[PDB]
Amino acid sequence: TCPFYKKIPGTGFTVDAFQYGVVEGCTAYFLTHFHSDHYAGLSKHFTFPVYCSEITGNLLKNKLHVQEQYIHPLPLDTECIVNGVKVVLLDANHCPGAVMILFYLPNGTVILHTGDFRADPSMERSLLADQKVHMLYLDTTYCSPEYTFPSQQEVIRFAINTAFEAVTLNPHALVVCGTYSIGKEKVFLAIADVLGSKVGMSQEKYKTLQCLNIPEINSLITTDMCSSLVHLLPMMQINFKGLQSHLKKCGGKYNQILAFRPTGWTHSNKFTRIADVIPQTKGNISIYGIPYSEHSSYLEMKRFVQWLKPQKIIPTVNVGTWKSRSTMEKYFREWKLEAGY
Ligand SMILES: O=C(OCc1ccccc1)N1CCC(O)CC1
Ligand code: NI
């Protein structure tokens, strides 16, 4: 059973709704981004039209093996007609290829679906500036005031400076970065650049990165682990046991590991500043958890919504409990009363 919040009223469209079989009445399936909770159910045997960005389309074809005849990539920032309805894709400031979708309904209603996003003041000068939005389907992942974290720029400055210091003190240190999906590529790219190295990884992860349209990517990444002093590993391996095991495989080239776990928010955000962050250490291994978010903080989300002034908000995250739903509804009303819409 497809939930109501994945259906767009007055259309035959669904959004991120691939795990419910054939949805009755659906003439086009939109996919906002290539994260597994959103693409769940897509496979090589899918036979309906999928609308998405070019980058998402590359990943569908190459990683999931969806046949090319069912993949409909659309350019960003461009008015397009899909089954008789005007739509626009906008950058969501999430992972590579992630979009928000503007739907212009035949009856004059305008709907914005944010997919997953990290709201930014730059969105206030997109094609959103032009007209009124009646309904907002909102990524509410962090819709509570306890969810604070730094800018992406601040977190990258910390990572670059930490890695450059450690490897300059000990040239035989290896840097490892955890990953389990697309997104957060700036973490490993920025560290490798300050160290004058390519990033080494598995054939499978290399394939994924080759789909992302990153400028000059062949200069930045490699499958030749021996040539690289920044390695990527699955997130599940970023622990003392898994890193000890990896160090053994490196043939006595290295005598220390510095590792990074990009998380989203963790409760240590409610005490500590980024500047004060310390690692967990066992012997010659140290692990840093860094709060690199690709979702809106509470303050970023509030600013975006109070600027956009929607008539109705439909949450798409944390929808499963009465407590969560009640909390979100209280915040939306505060925001509306404060700003006067
Ligand atoms: O039928 C609905 O949308 C139209 C639609 C039907 C089937 C496939 C795609 C789209 N909605 C919208 C939301 C309403 O609350 C109740 C369900
Ligand atoms: Ni996501």
From Swiss-Prot:
> What causes induction of this gene?
During mitosis. The mRNA encoding this protein contains an internal ribosome entry site (IRES) in its 5'-UTR. This 5'-UTR generally suppresses translation while specifically promoting expression during mitosis, when cap-dependent translation may be impaired.
Tissues where the protein occurs: Expressed in brain, heart, kidney, liver, pancreas, placenta and skeletal muscle.
What does the UniProt record report as the effect of altering D139N in this chain? Impaired nuclear focus formation, reduced interaction with PIAS and increased sensitivity to cisplatin
Q: Which residues form the signal peptide?
A: none
List where the protein spans the membrane: none
Subcellular location, record wording: Nucleus
Its subunit composition reads:
Binds constitutively to TP53BP1. Binds CDC27, which is itself a component of the anaphase promoting complex (APC). Binds PIAS1.
Similarity field = Belongs to the DNA repair metallo-beta-lactamase (DRMBL) family.
Function noted in UniProt: May be required for DNA interstrand cross-link repair. Also required for checkpoint mediated cell cycle arrest in early prophase in response to mitotic spindle poisons. Possesses beta-lactamase activity, catalyzing the hydrolysis of penicillin G and nitrocefin. Exhibits no activity towards other beta-lactam antibiotic classes including cephalosporins (cefotaxime) and carbapenems (imipenem).
- Official protein name in the record: DNA cross-link repair 1A protein
Source organism (scientific name): Homo sapiens
Q: Which gene encodes it?
A: DCLRE1A
Q: Which residues of the full protein are shown?
A: 700 to 1040 of 1040
